[PDB]
Amino acid sequence: TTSAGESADPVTATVENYGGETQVQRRQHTDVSFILDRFVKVTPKDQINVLDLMQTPAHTLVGALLRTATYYFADLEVAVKHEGNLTWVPNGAPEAALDNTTNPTAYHKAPLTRLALPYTAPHRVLATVYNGESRALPTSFNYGAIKATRVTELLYRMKRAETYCPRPLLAIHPDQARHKQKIVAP
Amino acid sequence: TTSAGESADPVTATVENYGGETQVQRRQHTDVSFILDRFVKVTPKDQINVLDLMQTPAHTLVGALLRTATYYFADLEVAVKHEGNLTWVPNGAPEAALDNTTNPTAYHKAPLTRLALPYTAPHRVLATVYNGESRALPTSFNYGAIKATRVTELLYRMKRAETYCPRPLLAIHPDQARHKQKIVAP
Amino acid sequence: SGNTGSIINNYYMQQYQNSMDTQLGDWFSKLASSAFSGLFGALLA
Amino acid sequence: SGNTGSIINNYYMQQYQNSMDTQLGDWFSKLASSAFSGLFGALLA
Amino acid sequence: DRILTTRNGHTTSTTQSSVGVTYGYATAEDFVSGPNTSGLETRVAQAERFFKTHLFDWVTSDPFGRCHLLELPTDHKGVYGYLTDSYAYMRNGWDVEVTAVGNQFNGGCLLVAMVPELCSIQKRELYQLTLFPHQFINPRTNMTAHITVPFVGVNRYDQYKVHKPWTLVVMVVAPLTVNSEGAPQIKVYANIAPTNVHVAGEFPSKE
Amino acid sequence: GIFPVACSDGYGGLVTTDPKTADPAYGKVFNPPRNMLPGRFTNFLDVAEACPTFLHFEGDVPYVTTKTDSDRVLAQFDLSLAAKHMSNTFLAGLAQYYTQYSGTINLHFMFTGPTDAKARYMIAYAPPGMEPPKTPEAAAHCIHAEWDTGLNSKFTFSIPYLSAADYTYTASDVAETTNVQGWVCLFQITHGKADGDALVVLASAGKDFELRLPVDARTQ
Amino acid sequence: GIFPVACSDGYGGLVTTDPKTADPAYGKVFNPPRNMLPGRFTNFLDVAEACPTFLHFEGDVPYVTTKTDSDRVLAQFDLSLAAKHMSNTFLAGLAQYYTQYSGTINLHFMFTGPTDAKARYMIAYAPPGMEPPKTPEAAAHCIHAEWDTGLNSKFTFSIPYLSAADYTYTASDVAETTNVQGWVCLFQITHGKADGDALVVLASAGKDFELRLPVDARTQ
Questions:
Q1: Residue range C1-45, CATH number
Q2: Chain D nearest CA to E205, separation (Å)
Q3: D20 Cβ under 8 Å from any chain G Cβ
Q4: Domains of chain E, with CATH numbers?
Q5: If DSSP codes are grouped into helix, strand and coil, which group holds residue G148?
Q6: Hey, which chains touch F, using 3+ CB pairs under 8 Å?
Q7: CB environment G180-216: b (16+ within 10 A), e (fewer)
Q8: Dihedral through CA C2, CA C4, CA C5, CA C10, nearest 10?
Q9: How far is E26 from chain D, CA to nearest CA, in Å?
Q10: Could you identify which of A8, A138, B56, F130 might form a hypothetical disulfide with B63, taking C-beta atoms 3.0 to 4.6 angstroms apart as the criterion?
Q11: G135-145: b or e for each residue (b if 16 or more CB lie within 10 Å)?
């Protein structure tokens, strides 16, 4: 399949070009809404925790995969293991609010609280990166904040996720011709 | 939009007056029935607790917001954390009744009892204020009384709330040009 | 209706849940909607 | 829909579950499907 | 003969090596009059017209990766520049046209991409730069890239005094070769034009 | 025999704000009748926009007097429901329970000089990202509107909603001082033997003003 | 009276990945509108195949220069998304989250010599179970395809999917070194005053490429 080189028009070339017969694809597992819908473990601050999605470690699946989008949208769903009551204040709320129980507080129950949170940021779509500043991402980009006497385990889960303009994503760089990691074996 | 000044007829002036185009309003969150339907934490008496709504702290959301109405109506719904059995006597019942278990007593269960109470006051509508006395609000204005060996946490929740003749409501008075409280940030 | 939100019909009667109201024999909304708008003016282009 | 999977209809309304979207007044798929294929060539047997 | 003659306002820009425009992300600008501006937005057509700017010299010693970034909108002395200094919110697409006229005996190529939100770039991620709306400029074939992109971002309108949503990024992918007959260097220029520029809420006078 | 069920972890903690109703205790009560009662309001923003309430200028007064000096600026303030000038309005009072807002704020100015005083006033709105105007000549380049005292004593002017975002925070952040929403400036073009006369001002919600996401932020 | 139920053991542990939704907390919110936004992708493999990305040859460059020696092998590498040559591609980058894959990998070669350089290249695919070819004469007996530089600078070639199994692992095992999926070899049949000219190469998904079973395998 020759073509013009500079064009940047997509040119897929099937195996048909040399005999051979394209097969059936099934791609459910690399659907964005699907792949992003899992729990991912963030390392908490002892007490007040802003619920940023950028707090997710950029190596982890949900971490690094969310980072390919420059703009995204999701509803959140945190599962947090804590002592005392847990209290979530919306987005753009004084941090002093984290003390008033009328804010969606959840009373303690073994062995973790799991609750779904609405997207609540005043922008249409959040961003994984922001060139207002050439970290250093607008404070407004968040899902709210939680507080407990002690949060210990905290897990994010994106629901309904939408994603826009893909940015690069990058594998671990090998030294030998094959990155020869030890595969599960019977 | 000029108009006559003393009239006290409502005069809304749209941005259309200078080009510009009124947008779409959505006001579900400032609906009375909606905004008043949350749990609000009152500080209990150790044992006998009249279930007044005025016992709610006048700074809190449900507190201060209920206080804008001069007359209101709601069904209550208390969630109380206690030791022993908890016993609710209706409105206008001798306080000596608080001992007889036949009155809607609830046996102890971890970790709080939550029960809905009917509006039970002999007046059509209660009042947040009452000029029989220029505190000092008729004893009849209540939802009943609860008693336990020890009530510790007690939380009110208005259901079906109706409200009548708005009285003023007032923000915290700033010293600087902006009341510059510290907003939740990522 | 308020700050309730389930699709399933409630388990208890209704008389056992709320108190039942009774007819015998809204304003600020009207008031707001009645608000005069635009101009007393003889507008120019 | 995503990574949800139950046949029973959800207990909570919908407005209480997700946030509700609002219309006002996809690409890469198109882009992929538009991919030219086969040959610029005058093919031989 | 692969001619293409653009124009924006009363300017133009023919080219006889077109290889054709790439539309990045969307082939048409979406909704403009939103709720956030109360219908006080307005189009300023006179802003939409080309403006030149030098990028770099592509010197034969440039290795792979030698990238240059141009955040947009830039220092701009004309109408579009004035707008920026006289309205608080605005939005526009871009319509970019990078030329690197060497000669057809030069070798090696540049890649030209419009990348949203680019505060500088890691080296290893330059390898996947073809994720953004791009085009190649390979002297044996063409002299010009041409890329058009819509307004993007977290907001319907932007404050450009504090946020530059696009960066133009020209990269060296294979180094230049002068050989016997090719140019000794190649200077690279950009010829950029705003598109569908709208503005809202005018600042008080500079006094 | 009996229907199996999986009692799941992470669910059915009491949550202070959850939709579910509680379990009844005492039944069959009938309320006294309360239909056709007077004065009902079903929405705080209906009460906010039917009923404008005073602004608070320096020395703690709702009016702003005229001035017989070279200065022309009657008042000037951040457009913030957290503002000091707004601090006694019902609208500010209600906004302290909600984290973000949107849409138009009206601003009614009632002149109350003697029948022989006269004046022109102006009201610009300067968007954020530049110093606010100090003079009417300068402010003329904003979304201004300008009126004069007559048989009709009142004048209402909507402050347009303009922001890069769709909503805007109701409260100021202690870090941010440059004022994110811009300013309103009330000037005084001219006056005619009007010195010492008051222009009382009041503020309400517009047709399209809306508050959202309640929050208890102490807020006394 | 009340409906009996059997609260069963072994069920309703929280499982990090379970389909069930969580219990709502705060209601009635309406998002700002985001229809017709630009650039949306609903599937990573749509983004993988619309947008090919560079390979990494020795000395850390995306191209492979010609050679004026007896040797003809421009490059040669295991067919493994875990490969060093693939290591910077988007496709490799995405494969590290999935344990097995299937289907065709495209491989685009763009020549970028001066108008007076010319060359023929070849690209064979040698299946596993024999040493890979060292010479084009030998490799001619593989699924090769062979092109030459002209007015059209690009050339794309699908690497066929061939395996005894239906899917194939995305990652190498530390035990296995003999390369289970076979090799691709890019040769250089001839060249004409082409010395020192680059052939930049890029790789994408084919129509039928597909990844499966996600896994977080550290993977930085």
A1: 4.10.90.10
A2: 34
A3: yes
A4: 1-207 (2.60.120.20)
A5: strand
A6: A, B, C, D, E, G
A7: bbbbbbbbbeebebbebbbbbbbbbbbbbbbbbebeb
A8: -120
A9: 7
A10: B56
A11: ebeebeebbbb
